[PDB]
């Protein structure tokens, strides 16, 4: 009875989506001038990791960046001078994510240890030591992003997301709507909402203040590995293991466009957006990183040069460079 | 570095100091044997951890014959294996533990499924994984004495009809070992080291040492280029 009612509600939502969509995005964007070919030359090469990098996050000053490696190191980099700024030894060898605070006071990392570790970088003593441990997840930490210097949203392999208060040391809010492992999360510019994708091929939009799921986005055929908001906070792109990326509009609540190419069958590790949002950069498992024109849906450029498989990709805050992290222990900046 | 200021030069020097520390720690890590550990609670994985030793992942660092061994226990996590299985692509060997007596015990689920035939599927899915094609697998068969008593008391024919052997401890153990070896679909690339867990710690630790030693020989030959 309840299952039949749920199916009826899903059918009603699908009918509303079908009726709502009148004009295809591709047709509307057909008349816009194409971006042609985009070529980005390597500017900086970062070495010394000596292990498969998994996570990089840009700061808001557009110069420092954090990087996570599987030797037990977080390295904080000066991107302009190539010098290493910080080298944090980690308690847990296996780290799958790393978040750099907007202020830059703290660095958050996490992984298979079920802990999210917050490191203070502005300590008077001068040694980067463990400030706060967010213990309470049942699955592996997959993504984490600071909102403020006191509140953080983390995703875990227990199908849930959590809002943790750093000073309290406990999870203020629990988000339990997904049925699969939550692989990524992205914060909007206002920070009032955050969308996260899971291993059930769906993404969900969660309200930080209220604590419930606002919207549910389906359309992928496989596990969603990456999610990032469009710069205006009204849309987000997802990349999945079915060799496709999709664009979902929060207000429209439907699949605006799909970015797929026949030759490339490998899954998308990470996705990032440019300052104008016109270009979408996705790191594939084909050892390359593709730049796709968002409106046109064509392919605008290729970033080749990572011998081992790409694991993370991030566009800086002012949009002046893109830094890619791969499993060959080399962080490459493309401009 | 004439153009660079005093602070810039000092920052470059700090970078070089960090590079030195990272190279020294990498040289330390290059002498560490990293062992993946798999199996369940019934299998007796905790027992081998206790014998060898002298929430998400349990690390049991130890030393044997001046060689550093690192064992990671991922069993505790209930998250999907596939998502983090590629994180261990740089592991010398995989120690997989099963229990010989598991076949009699059947989980009280909605449908009756043999535990041993679950462990066989788990071994198959781990062994044929693309990430671990060249990685070696050490196979530990726990609860030998209990297996002996169980096999003599109750025949093995009842679980799976295909076996036609008599109710003999050694014959049944050999059949289980050959079936597990048969599960591997790429024998030429992947050695499997099968062993019967002894009460004496030293025998099991020595067998792990020998398997790891063979893996080190294979890696050294590959670096030399003989293979």
């Amino acid at each position: 009875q309840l299952r039949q009612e749920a199916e009826q509600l899903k059918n009603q939502i699908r009918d509303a989506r079908k009726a709502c969509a009148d004009a295809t995005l591709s047709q509307i964007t057909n008349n816009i001038d194409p971006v042609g070919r985009i070529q980005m030359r390597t500017r900086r090469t970062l070495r010394g990791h000596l292990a498969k990098i998994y996570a990089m996050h840009w700061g808001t000053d557009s110069r420092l960046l954090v990087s996570a490696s599987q030797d037990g190191k977080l390295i904080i980099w000066d991107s302009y001078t190539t010098n290493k700024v910080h080298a944090i030894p980690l308690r847990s060898s296996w780290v799958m994510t790393c978040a750099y605070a907007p202020s830059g006071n703290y660095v958050a990392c996490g992984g298979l240890d079920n802990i999210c570790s917050i490191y203070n970088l502005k300590t008077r003593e001068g040694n980067v030591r463990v400030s706060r441990e967010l213990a309470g997840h049942t699955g592996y930490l997959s993504c984490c992003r600071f909102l403020d210097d006191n509140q953080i949203v983390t995703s875990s392999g227990d199908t849930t997301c959590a809002l943790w208060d750093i000073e309290t040391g406990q999870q203020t809010t629990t988000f339990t709507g997904h049925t699969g492992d939550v692989m990524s999360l992205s914060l909007a510019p206002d920070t009032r909402l955050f969308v996260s994708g899971a291993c059930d091929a769906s993404a969900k939009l969660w309200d930080v203040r209220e604590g419930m799921c606002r919207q549910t986005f389906t359309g992928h055929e496989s596990d969603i590995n990456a999610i990032c908001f469009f710069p205006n906070g009204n849309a987000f792109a997802t990349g999945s293991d079915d060799a496709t990326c999709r664009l979902f509009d929060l207000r429209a609540d439907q699949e605006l466009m799909t970015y797929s190419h026949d030759n490339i069958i490998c899954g998308i590790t990470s996705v990032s957006f440019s300052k104008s949002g016109r270009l979408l950069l996705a790191g594939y498992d084909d050892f390359n990183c593709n730049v796709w024109d968002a409106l046109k849906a064509d392919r605008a450029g290729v970033l080749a040069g990572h011998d081992n498989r790409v694991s993370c990709l991030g566009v800086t805050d002012d949009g002046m460079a893109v830094a890619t992290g791969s499993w060959d222990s080399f962080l490459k900046i493309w401009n | 570095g004439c153009t660079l200021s005093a602070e810039d030069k000092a920052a470059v020097e700090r970078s070089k100091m960090i590079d030195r520390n990272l190279r020294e720690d990498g040289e330390k890590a290059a002498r560490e044997v990293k062992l993946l550990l798999l199996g369940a609670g019934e299998s007796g994985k905790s027992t081998i951890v206790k014998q060898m030793k002298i929430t998400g992942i349990v690390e049991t660092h130890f030393t044997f014959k001046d060689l550093h061994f690192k064992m990671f226990d991922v069993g505790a996590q209930r998250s999907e294996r596939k998502k983090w299985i590629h994180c261990f692509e740089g592991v010398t060997a995989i120690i997989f533990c099963v229990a010989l007596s598991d076949y009699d015990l059947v989980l009280a689920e909605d449908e009756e499924m043999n535990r041993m035939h679950e462990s066989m599927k788990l071994f198959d899915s781990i062994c044929n994984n693309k990430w671990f094609t060249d990685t070696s697998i050490i196979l530990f068969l726990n609860k030998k004495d209990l297996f002996e008593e169980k096999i003599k008391k109750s025949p093995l024919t009842i679980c799976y009809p295909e076996y036609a052997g008599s109710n003999t401890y050694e014959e049944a153990a050999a059949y289980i070992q050959c079936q597990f070896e048969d599960l591997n679909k790429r024998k030429d690339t992947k050695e499997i080291y099968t062993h019967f867990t002894c009460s004496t710690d030293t025998k099991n630790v020595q067998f792990v040492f020998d398997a790891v030693t063979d893996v080190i020989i294979k890696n050294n030959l590959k670096d030399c280029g003989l293979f």
């Epitope: 830059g104 003593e125 040694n127 | 005093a6 602070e7 070089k16």
Partner: single-chain antibody, 234 residues
Framework: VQLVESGGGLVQPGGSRKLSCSAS????????MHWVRQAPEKGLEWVAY????????YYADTVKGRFTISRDDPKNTLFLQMTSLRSEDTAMYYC??????????????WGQGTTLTVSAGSADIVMTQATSSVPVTPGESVSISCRSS???????????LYWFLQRPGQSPQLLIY???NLASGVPDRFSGSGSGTAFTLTISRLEAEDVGVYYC?????????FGAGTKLEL
């Protein structure tokens, strides 16, 4: 974070003396160290620097060859060996910890000072404190001017000017590092402004406690040269 120096007392000219500074409550091995001298009734003066890990060492030319700086990291101790002392070395010597990276605050923490009494540079940038004393009342905003002999604006664009405050009878503290960033723990009363060769410190809503000797330092190239020192009074 604490630094205490020992080895003071009277010395005869031409003798030798070893000072030692013991550091507690911080990662001594990761900080570069400075020795800075202060004449009895005159401004401060930079003596020497040793990087973290001892990779680079700098000395003032007046003390070049006579003074030897060294550090022992397992004991967290800084040593200064002084041979053939002269009558100009009767000064109070401070130890300074400094870390160098993007966004770091070097010269943030100052030692306590060991007094030593020896009882009987055209290329280098010169810092010009134009005034010497300014009489002030608690509450008014006060401006202090400093000048340089060379443009302190590097190609990167970060000015290498530091503003320090020495209270009467106390160690000097860092106030502003790089002329645009306040040092951690300094109230927002202080602000730095200006351009190459002309620099200004503005103290809005001043307090009696704030009053002290203000020093402007360049940090473009070695040897470091300090300013004369603008004193405030009541």
């Amino acid at each position: 974070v604490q630094l205490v120096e020992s080895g003071g007392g009277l010395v005869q000219p031409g003798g030798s003396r070893k000072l030692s500074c013991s550091a507690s409550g911080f990662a001594f091995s990761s900080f570069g160290m400075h020795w800075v001298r202060q004449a009895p009734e005159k401004g401060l003066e930079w003596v020497a620097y040793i990087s973290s890990g001892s990779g680079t060492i700098y000395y003032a030319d007046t003390v070049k060859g006579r003074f030897t700086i060294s550090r022992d990291d397992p004991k967290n101790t800084l040593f200064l060996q002084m041979t053939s002392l002269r009558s100009e070395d009767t000064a109070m010597y401070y130890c300074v910890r400094s870390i160098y990276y993007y966004g770091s605050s070097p010269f943030d923490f100052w030692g306590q000072g060991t007094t030593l009494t020896v009882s009987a540079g055209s290329a280098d940038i010169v810092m010009t404190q134009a005034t010497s004393s300014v009489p002030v009342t608690p509450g008014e905003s006060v401006s202090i001017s400093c000048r340089s002999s060379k443009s302190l604006l590097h190609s990167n664009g970060n000015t290498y000017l530091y503003w320090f405050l020495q209270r009467p009878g106390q160690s000097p503290q860092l106030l502003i590092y790089r002329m645009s960033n306040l040092a951690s723990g300094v109230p927002d009363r202080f602000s730095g402004s200006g351009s190459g060769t002309a620099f200004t410190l503005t103290i809005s809503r001043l307090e009696a406690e704030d009053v002290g000797v203000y020093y402007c330092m360049q940090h473009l190239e070695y040897p470091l040269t300090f300013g004369a020192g603008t004193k405030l009074e009541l």
